[PDB]
């Protein structure tokens, strides 16, 4: 009935309107993976781009969202840009009223409380991405939040995402000085997992260190994937 | 096409104002008679009696209704307050006619959205002008329709009243007298007792419960 | 059948990309009278069969004046025609008393254009339903726009729109070489237009009552012809 | 299956599937439109369309949005319109704002911002265009194609509409025989359109960054080739 | 939600988004010959009383 | 004129004071008592608002108000018409029904809190109370040795009323 | 039209002042032509009181 | 026709409100009774079980003023609502006459918002029947219940509830008004001993209340157990 | 468009549909359970987590309302957690801010009722899939444990528990509840019902308890105020979680 | 692009002004019965002499939101306003609630005000047009 | 909503009819206060406590009107509570002192508190001014109140960087006694908090502290009465 047309309970008890935007975040067949080290946290996404047309220099799911933040999105890229301009002004907001650089988990603490609004209006559909932020935060270090359409939210170790998440997590349970020997190892461990010995094009790397997030350019995952092909 | 205020049927009715009379045709009987002089108005073991249906909106005009009883009360508590605004902005009490004409416009607003139900009350207003003394009597109607009647009956059984009084009554040998008009409106209630009576001059009584006119009128 | 599934609102394309809700608006030009348009480089000129509802009824105005310079023709949704002439005079208004400059044709156009526009895509309205045909002259000469209630515009040398439009059309079709080079002597455009709009006519005639005529130009502001001032070009 | 009967007469409704079966149905809509092309060159970016009363020097299916920026839509008319004044007006105040004309990527993502909005309530349906765009930029030039449901990638080429695949595949050969100059992409649309004529270019050499009808003298001898 | 993005969308200056001063001034038809109890101008300050008295 | 005129408060071992000049001036709310001076219509209004709050809030809490709570809501209310304040000086007295404590405090027009552990003037003619109280008062008298103390100061600030008020009874009293 | 000989056929009023030289006769939902009425008289006042 | 609580059916008739007094029938009977020199009221407490805080639990009977209390039967979250509401009325009503609130008039009120509730779409009736027992002096003591629908009537005993056809058969036998509060007070136990669907009438499956002589007095369970043997519960 | 319908409305039985499947929500969701003492109150629940490699220590399930007063929940997370915001807000805005101390526990349980029961007559949300154990300590009402359901219904009760395990714990406590239990006897009980309520691996890791008691000085942050007061609301540590569980 | 409220004065004054309580007898004047502010004595003439901080206290948070507003669109253009302002006036027009005074749980969230008080939440702040009726007509505009 | 404006016009019409230092020093702060006040030339009240809490390590202590430096005070300490509790972090300085700032400039100086911060926070011991108007300064040394020039006078003669704990406790009370001696608005005795970054908070309340009952019956009673409650 409206159950299935709005986010209402069903006789279940069951929100079938965000179980439904779950499924919508494996609609693009990308999976990333998200790993800490000491002093630094590293965010692994495939870039599938098999259309000779497409122009790979554009096809970004990791965005940039604070000097500090980033956050890797899965799910289609219009609600993932959405989220991003959203998340992005919700942390300069943050930096403007309270004086000091928002934490990753207060902006993903955030951004589930919008997810929740999203999950509980009636005219309001849930936005369909899953949001992974990583950050070096001044107090906690390194840390890992992942946000779910249905505004659920938690910290991680690690991550991975999409399809094939199941595989990475558990070559990452089969595993649990410089932020380069952390990309090697994230890279080394998704090419273990998925059986896909990576083009230079068929990865983006983002990098959070101490001072700044920043992402890989080819060039850089170019000399990773040799740094690998060394061992 | 029945379930919105806003659609017309395809032969023109506006059913859900149609089903807001027949929520008023379920409600308690009332009935209203114009005399000469005056107008008169009628209709569990353990209630508790101190705390009649016939509700003066001024000292000089009276509002009945027959429907939902909440509804009502909304409607005469809204009559009440324009009869006090008008009597203040204006230094003349209301018109008897103005003030059916502010209920039917009410009644009418509640049924301009369909985010709002209409009230489900007829209302049955009886009074004088101030200084004046042509008896005046008027139905409003969900719809916000008002009309003036010499005679009129809303409710349970307002068929067979209204059946009795159109042959009972005589539009140009009206009741000339006051026992008279309550006689005719107890007879007519006697065929399905309160009786208020009107009188020019701000005089309204509740008829004190007097079964004489009953016992007269069985032994008739 | 299918079709009444996906035709409740302007909001819902059908799993054929149609949005039939727009068609409906589209198909409501078909209903209206025919009008023709046409115009040379110095003028240009509206025809226009009126209708009335019964032999006891005036015939409805068919034709409209933004200004001195430009004017307009109605065919389709009587309200909505109101609403866009009434739109497009406060624009004509507006735009002379802030800039105290006559507001270009194609401008207009453009504007009601951009108005139609917004109906087509919220629920809660509905497209105008009315074809407008504009004609003006201005700094660049004369005009003739066909506005749809889609939400399109096109500048033309002539057209027809209402019911048996296409007859129209098509006569025009045949003689635009023609009509085009009648500059200055805007008598022969006219008569060009009534003859144009002598084709596409059932059942009846061109008559002082029924015809309406329209003119402007470079010498000649905005002119509407109408009952006894017809019967010259009968 | 591609109808969805259940969950698609309401925008915003995801399907169990997650898919949101009115933005595919828009999508459908723009199979409809004019078969559109868009071509980049190393210096730049080359449009061209496949396309009596109508007055000829105003019937123009290329849209300017700016003389930085152009656009060329398919599907809806009104919709189209709307979305090109929308970017028109997002243009005009980012130059009235920086003092620079509108970088492509920023124009993008005004553009794929206020499409994507329209996808998230029931109020309001999505635009019913694809619309490819481009030109000479700061850093180069870029092509992109936005299509109904927001989504945006960058474009070495792009075709739209209902003779969309074969363009595709003509203008992928083109590509894998040249991993172009102005003048042979100019060629090279109008014979893939081939495969009336308008046509459009921005390149720094050749239009001096700005855009500009393909016209006159350089459209007959495209035509020539095609 | 057009409604809302046009209002995101050199009116300002002359102040002709105001529709009580289209109306004043007639751009928005005849209504300021159309409403009962026609409306007054009152001067756009702290003390309008003070602004009057010194007419 | 029944504007104005001069309230004290005063505490004891085990016992609370509070007197007036004397309408009335002097409120209680259970055993929280409140004297304002000031504006007769500003101490109607503050006296009904005050019986409507607390008898709120002993709905609301099953439970008669305790002087400190009290004081803050006195405080809060009153800070609530910061932008034309009432004309007023209020003043609490009570007993903390738990401890026993004794308690006296009073207020500016926009409630900050003197909360003064000895005693509390306020209104017309309070730095002669002050000199007053100051002189006469001793820490810890007895309730009939602090009625004689309070009653007798304000006497000597210039037909008064005086409350002692214990844990468990409050005897009222009036002095020429 | 009388729905009943008790309705007083003097108070029906189906035809109405607008202004002095123009009259109006209702037919349908007597509500909405009170509502046209009232409108069309404002109109008409409003008129008189502007343009004299 | 019953989807939406502003619909009329083609009867004429609001399901959606026929439903939120179907509601009613749920609730653990409530019971009122007006006596010579003052009011009884009682109420089921259905909702039982060992582990809840019967001491605390004060879940039925809710005084809204001095001299005014009410029995709740229905939706505690909506009962609560309008008790504070009522509260507030109340206290606005002493703030500006100075003077208590006649029990009819804050009747009026409560009873004006729940119909409220049932004319605009966006909101449902309130699930809840109060019975308001108080006193004021120009009727004395008197006693009121409302419905879901914003009616209300004044009685001199009545039930509210699962089984008030029952309840107020047993009244209308055994009620003479005549009678004084502590034999109305037995009336009431007596009344509810014989209507609950429980084996027995144990003292925690019951709230009590008396308004008379003016006080107003909510038994603590000690004095309800004394009260129930003392009747022979 | 000025108006929604309710979302929320009576069946034909009486019954308010969106209420039973927000009831059915909360049967749907893990266990917790709390207990009053005599001298403190147990509040306790399984950090459920889809991974492993989740931060166990960011699952806050228990969270603290006021000094005195905190809360658990069974059901939609994201709902408990804006309920949460909300109840701090107006325990601050609505009583601090005016009488200058913290609510006691049975206002503060009445104000998220109120928040919680106002979902269900608007026309634009459901109801929260959520109820609520709140715990707390007033200094006139003492210790205080209440359930809070979707309806925005409440009750006081000795011991209880919402979710999955909810009858069986309900069960165990009632017949291991009595009313001499001390807060180490408590906290044993409540350990043990919830060792018999959760699936899989119990360690001190899975699950995370708070208790409400004694005030904790050194929990207050600061020294020389002598009658201001320590919060009584505690977290325990997994580690002394741990070795409760050697006990 | 305002940090003070600049637009704080009403430039036109009519008896009319004022809709929702106007008198019925004579649709040109208050209906001073129902505004229920003491009579007619609050006259709108006597809107003189207002305190300097009223009118920029009462509408400071109104020109930060529209500062706020602006500088999305300055920065992301006219597509982020527009969400912010849909998804701001759905919230406020679907939450309709008689009896509460309390400001909704999720217009909170979306304000970013779930961990801010101010004056206005620690103090929110009549025998006629009080009624739940009077705010049925007053929000759907009966 | 919010202060109420509603007496403005009345009030119009019927009229028509302290020292405070903050001490920074090697691993924290001080902030002290003399405790005497004043209505008028007359002390309304000894021993008053000036020294605020924002949070457990944020303390305040402010000058103007004492009413609004509480109430904006507390409001402070509930937003910065709040967020604490929001982002489960203990709160820093910097995030009080811009709520602060941004809430005094939001009255445009109508709310007269002028205020000394002083904290420890995650970054570090931290000693702020904030002025009624909304404008702040950072400082390592601070005084404030009719005292603060002789304060100052005393700071600046005996700061010195690296001050101890001890030494800057001195040094504060220093200031405080000369504020005492040489100004009239201060007086009684010496209020200390001493904010240490790796320790609690010690407050130190009165830090530095520097028969006339008549015979019973002397009144006359003119009557008596029972009053009950």
Not at chain 3, 106 to 132: I, M
Request: with cysteine; net charge negative.
């Amino acid at each position: 009935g409206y159950d299935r047309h709005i986010t209402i309970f069903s006789p279940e008890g069951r929100l079938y309107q965000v179980e439904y935007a779950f499924k919508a975040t494996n609609q693009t067949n990308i999976n990333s993976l998200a790993v800490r080290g000491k002093d630094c946290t590293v965010v692994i996404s495939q870039k599938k781009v098999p259309d000779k047309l497409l122009d790979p220099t554009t096809v970004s799911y990791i965005f940039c969202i604070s000097r500090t933040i980033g956050m890797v999105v899965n799910g289609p890229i219009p609600d993932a840009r959405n989220a991003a301009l959203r998340a992005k002004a919700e942390a300069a907001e943050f930096r403007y009223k309270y004086g000091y650089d928002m934490p990753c988990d207060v902006l993903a603490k955030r951004m589930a409380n919008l997810s929740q609004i999203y999950t509980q209006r009636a005219y309001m559909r849930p936005l369909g991405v899953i949001l992974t932020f990583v950050s070096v935060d001044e107090e906690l270090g390194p840390s890992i939040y992942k946000t779910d359409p249905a505004g659920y939210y938690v910290g991680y170790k690690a991550t991975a995402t999409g399809p094939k998440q199941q595989e990475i997590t558990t070559n990452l349970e089969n595993h649990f000085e410089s932020w380069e020997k952390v990309v090697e190892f994230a890279i080394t461990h998704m090419i273990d997992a998925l059986g896909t010995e990576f083009s230079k094009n068929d990865l983006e790397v983002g990098v959070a260190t101490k001072d700044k997030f920043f992402t890989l350019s080819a060039e850089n995952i170019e000399e990773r994937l040799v740094a690998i092909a060394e061992q | 096409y029945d379930r919105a205020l806003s659609i017309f049927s395809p032969d023109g009715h506006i059913f859900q104002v149609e089903y807001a009379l027949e929520a008023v045709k379920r409600g308690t009987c009332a009935v209203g008679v114009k005399g000469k002089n005056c107008v008169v108005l009628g209709c569990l073991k353990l209630q508790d009696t101190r705390i009649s249906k016939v509700s003066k909106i001024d000292s000089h005009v009276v509002l009945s209704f027959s429907g939902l009883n909440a509804d009502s009360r909304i409607l005469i508590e809204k009559a009440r307050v324009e009869a006090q605004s008008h009597r203040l902005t204006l230094e003349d009490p209301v018109t008897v006619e103005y003030l059916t004409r502010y209920v039917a416009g009410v009644q009418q607003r509640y049924t301009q959205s369909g985010g709002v139900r209409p009230f489900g009350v007829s209302t049955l207003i009886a009074g004088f002008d101030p200084r004046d003394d042509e008896p005046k009597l008027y139905q409003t109607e969900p719809s916000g329709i008002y009309s003036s009647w010499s005679a009129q009956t809303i409710g349970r059984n307002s068929k067979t009243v209204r059946e009795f009084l159109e042959k009972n009554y005589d539009r140009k040998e009206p009741p000339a007298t006051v026992e008279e008009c309550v006689k005719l409106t107890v007879r007519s209630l006697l065929e399905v007792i309160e009786i208020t009576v009107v009188k020019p001059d701000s005089d309204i009584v509740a008829l004190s419960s007097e079964e004489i006119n009953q016992y007269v009128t069985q032994i008739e | 059948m299918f079709r009444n599934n996906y035709d409740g609102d302007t909001v819902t394309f059908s799993p054929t990309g149609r949005l039939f809700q727009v068609e409906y608006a589209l198909e409501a030009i078909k209903q209206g009278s025919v009008t023709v348009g046409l115009r040379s480089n110095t003028h240009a000129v509206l025809v226009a069969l009126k209708r009335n509802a019964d032999e006891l009824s005036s015939y409805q105005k068919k034709i409209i004046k933004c200004d001195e310079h430009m004017g307009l023709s109605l065919a389709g949704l009587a309200p909505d025609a109101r609403v866009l002439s009434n739109y497009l005079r406060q624009q004509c208004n507006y735009s002379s008393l802030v800039f105290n400059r006559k507001l270009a044709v194609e401008r207009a156009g453009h504007l009601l254009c951009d108005k139609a526009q917004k109906n087509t895509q919220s629920y809660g309205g509905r497209p105008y339903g009315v074809g407008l045909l504009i004609i003006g002259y201005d700094k660049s000469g004369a005009h003739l726009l066909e506005f749809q209630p889609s939400g399109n515009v096109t500048e033309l040398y002539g057209t027809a729109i209402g019911a048996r439009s296409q007859g129209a059309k098509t006569y025009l079709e045949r003689t635009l070489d023609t009509f085009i080079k009648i500059d200055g002597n805007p008598d022969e455009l006219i008569k060009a237009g009534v003859e144009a709009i002598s084709q596409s006519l059932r059942d009846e005639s061109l008559t002082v009552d029924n015809l309406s005529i329209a003119i402007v130009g470079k010498d000649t502001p905005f002119t509407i012809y109408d009952g006894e001032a017809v019967a010259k070009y009968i | 299956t591609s109808i969805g009967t259940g969950y698609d007469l309401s925008n915003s409704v995801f399907s169990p599937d997650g898919r949101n079966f009115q933005v595919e149905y828009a999508v459908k809509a723009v199979e409809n439109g004019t078969t559109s092309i868009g071509i980049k060159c190393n210096d730049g970016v080359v449009f061209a369309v496949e396309k009596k009363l109508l007055v000829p020097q105003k019937n123009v299916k290329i849209q300017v949005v700016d003389r930085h920026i152009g656009c060329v839509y398919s599907g809806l008319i009104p919709d189209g319109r709307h979305l090109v004044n929308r970017g028109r007006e997002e243009a005009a105040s980012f130059k009235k704002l920086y003092k620079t004309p509108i970088p492509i990527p920023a124009f993008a993502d005004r553009l794929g911002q206020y499409v994507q909005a329209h996808t998230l309530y029931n109020s309001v349906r999505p635009f019913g265009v694809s619309t490819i765009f481009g030109g000479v930029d700061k850093n180069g030039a870029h092509l992109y194609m936005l299509e109904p449901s927001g989504s945006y990638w960058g474009y070495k080429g792009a075709a739209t509409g209902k003779g969309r695949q074969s363009a595709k595949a003509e203008l992928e050969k083109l590509v894998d025989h040249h991993p172009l100059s102005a003048r042979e992409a100019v060629k090279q649309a109008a014979k893939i359109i081939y495969l009336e004529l308008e046509i459009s270019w921005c390149s720094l050499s050749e239009t001096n960054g700005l855009h500009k009808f393909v016209k006159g003298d350089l459209l007959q001898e495209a035509i020539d080739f095609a | 939600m057009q409604a809302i993005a046009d209002s995101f969308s050199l009116v300002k200056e002359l102040q002709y988004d105001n529709e009580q001063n289209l109306e004043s001034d007639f751009v928005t038809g005849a209504s300021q010959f159309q409403r009962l109890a026609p409306s007054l101008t009152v001067p756009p300050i702290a003390s309008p009383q003070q602004f009057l008295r010194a007419h | 004129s029944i504007n104005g005129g001069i309230v004290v408060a005063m505490t004891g071992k085990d016992c609370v004071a509070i007197a007036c000049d004397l309408f009335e001036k002097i409120f209680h709310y259970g055993h929280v008592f409140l004297g304002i001076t000031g504006l007769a219509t500003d101490v109607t209004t503050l006296n009904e608002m005050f019986r409507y709050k607390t008898n709120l809030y002993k709905l609301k809490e099953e439970r008669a108000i305790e002087p400190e709570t009290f004081t803050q809501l006195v405080s809060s209310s009153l800070y609530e018409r910061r932008f034309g304040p009432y004309f007023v000086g209020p003043v609490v007295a009570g007993i903390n029904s738990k401890s026993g404590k004794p308690f006296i405090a009073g207020f500016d027009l926009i409630g900050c809190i003197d909360e003064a552990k000895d005693f509390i003037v306020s209104g017309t003619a309070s730095d002669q109370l002050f000199g007053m109280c100051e002189s006469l008062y001793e820490p810890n008298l007895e309730p009939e040795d602090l009625f004689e103390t309070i009653s007798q100061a304000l006497l000597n600030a210039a037909g008064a009323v005086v409350y002692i008020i214990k844990k468990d009874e409050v005897v009222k009293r009036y002095l020429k | 039209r009388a729905t009943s000989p008790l309705l007083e056929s003097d108070s029906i009023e189906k035809i109405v002042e607008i202004d002095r030289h123009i009259g109006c006769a209702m037919s349908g939902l007597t509500a909405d032509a009170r509502s046209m009425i009232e409108h069309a008289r404002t109109a008409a006042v409003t008129h008189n009181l502007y343009y004299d | 026709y019953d989807s939406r609580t502003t619909i009329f059916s083609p009867e004429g008739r609001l399901y959606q409100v026929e439903y939120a007094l179907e509601s009613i029938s749920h609730a653990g009977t409530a019971i009122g009774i007006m006596a010579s020199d003052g009011i009884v009221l009682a109420a089921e407490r259905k909702v039982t079980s060992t582990l809840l805080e019967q001491d605390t639990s004060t879940e039925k009977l809710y005084k809204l003023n001095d001299k005014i209390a009410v029995a709740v039967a229905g939706l505690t979250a909506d009962a609560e609502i309008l008790i504070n509401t009522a509260r507030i009325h109340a206290q606005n009503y002493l703030k500006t006459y100075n003077e208590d609130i006649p029990v009819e008039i804050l009747v009026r009120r409560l009873s004006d918002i729940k119909q409220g509730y049932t004319q605009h779409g966006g909101l449902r009736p309130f699930g809840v029947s109060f019975i308001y027992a108080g006193y004021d002096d120009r009727y004395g003591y008197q006693l009121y219940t409302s419905n879901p629908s914003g009616n209300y009537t004044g009685w001199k005993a009545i039930s509210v509830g699962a089984n008030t056809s029952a309840a107020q058969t047993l009244l209308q036998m055994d009620y003479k008004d005549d009678m004084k509060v502590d034999d109305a007070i037995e009336l009431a136990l007596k009344t509810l001993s014989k209507t609950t669907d429980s084996s027995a009438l144990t003292y925690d499956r019951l709230e009590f209340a008396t308004i008379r002589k003016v006080y107003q007095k909510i038994f603590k369970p000690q004095e309800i157990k004394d009260i129930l043997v003392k009747t022979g519960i | 468009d000025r108006y929604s319908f309710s979302l929320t409305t009576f069946s034909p039985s009486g019954k308010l549909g969106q209420i039973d499947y927000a009831l059915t929500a909360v049967k749907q969701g893990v266990t917790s359970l709390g207990i009053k003492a005599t001298n403190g109150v147990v509040i306790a629940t399984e950090k459920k987590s889809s991974s492993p490699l989740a931060m166990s220590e960011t699952l806050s399930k228990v969270s603290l309302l006021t000094p005195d007063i905190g809360a658990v929940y069974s059901g939609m997370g994201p709902d408990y957690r804006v309920l949460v915001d909300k109840s701090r807000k107006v325990a601050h805005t609505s009583y601090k801010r005016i009488y200058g101390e913290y609510p006691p526990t049975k206002l503060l349980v009445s104000e998220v009722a109120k928040i919680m029961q106002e979902a269900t007559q608007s026309g634009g949300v459901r109801p929260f899939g959520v109820s609520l154990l709140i715990a707390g300590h007033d200094e006139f009402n003492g210790f205080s444990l209440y359930q809070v359901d979707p309806s925005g219904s409440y009750f006081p009760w000795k011991a209880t528990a919402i979710g999955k395990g909810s009858v069986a714990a309900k069960t165990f406590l009632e017949k291991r509840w009595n009313d001499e239990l001390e807060l180490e006897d408590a906290i044993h009980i409540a350990l043990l019902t919830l060792k018999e309520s959760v699936e899989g691996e119990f360690n001190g890791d899975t699950i995370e308890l708070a208790i409400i008691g004694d005030e904790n000085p050194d929990l207050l942050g600061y020294t020389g105020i002598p009658t201001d007061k320590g919060p009584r609301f505690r977290k325990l540590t997994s580690q002394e979680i741990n070795d409760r569980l050697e006990a | 692009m305002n940090i003070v409220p600049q637009d704080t004065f009403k430039s036109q004054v009519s008896t009319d002004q004022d809709k929702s309580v106007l008198s019925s007898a004579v649709p040109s004047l208050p209906d001073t019965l129902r505004q229920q502010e003491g009579g007619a004595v609050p006259l709108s003439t006597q809107l003189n002499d207002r305190h300097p901080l009223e009118s920029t206290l009462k509408n400071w948070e109104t020109t930060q939101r529209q500062r706020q507003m602006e500088q999305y669109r300055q920065i992301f253009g006219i597509a982020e306003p527009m969400k912010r302002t849909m998804e701001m006036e759905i919230v406020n027009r679907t939450d309709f609630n008689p009896l509460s005074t309390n400001g909704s749980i999720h217009r909170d969230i979306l304000l970013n005000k779930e961990c801010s008080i101010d004056w206005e939440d620690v103090y929110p702040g009549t025998m006629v047009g009080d009624d739940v009726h009077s705010k049925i007509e007053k929000q759907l505009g009966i | 909503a919010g202060l109420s404006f509603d007496n403005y016009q009345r009030n119009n019409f019927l009229a028509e009819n302290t020292t405070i230092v903050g001490v920074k020093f090697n691993n924290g702060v001080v902030i002290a206060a003399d405790t005497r006040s004043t209505q008028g030339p007359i002390v309304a009240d000894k021993n008053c406590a000036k020294l605020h809490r924002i949070s457990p390590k944020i303390w305040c202590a402010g000058a103007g009107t004492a009413a609004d430096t509480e109430a904006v005070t507390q409001l402070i300490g509930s937003n910065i509570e709040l967020h604490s509790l929001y982002t489960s972090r203990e709160p820093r300085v910097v995030s009080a002192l811009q709520m602060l700032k941004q809430h005094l400039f939001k009255y445009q100086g109508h709310i007269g508190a002028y205020l000394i911060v002083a904290g420890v926070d995650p970054t570090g011991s931290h000693l702020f001014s904030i002025h009624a108007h909304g404008s702040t300064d950072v400082g390592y040394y601070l005084s404030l109140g009719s005292g603060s020039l002789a304060a100052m006078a005393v700071l600046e003669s005996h700061w010195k960087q690296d001050l101890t704990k001890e030494e800057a406790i001195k040094l504060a009370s220093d200031a405080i006694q000369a504020g005492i001696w040489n100004d009239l608005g201060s007086g009684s005795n010496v209020d200390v908090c001493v904010m240490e970054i790796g320790k609690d908070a010690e407050y130190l309340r009165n830090y530095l502290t520097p028969s006339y009952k008549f015979p019973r019956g002397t009144t006359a009673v003119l009557k008596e009465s029972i009053v009950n409650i």
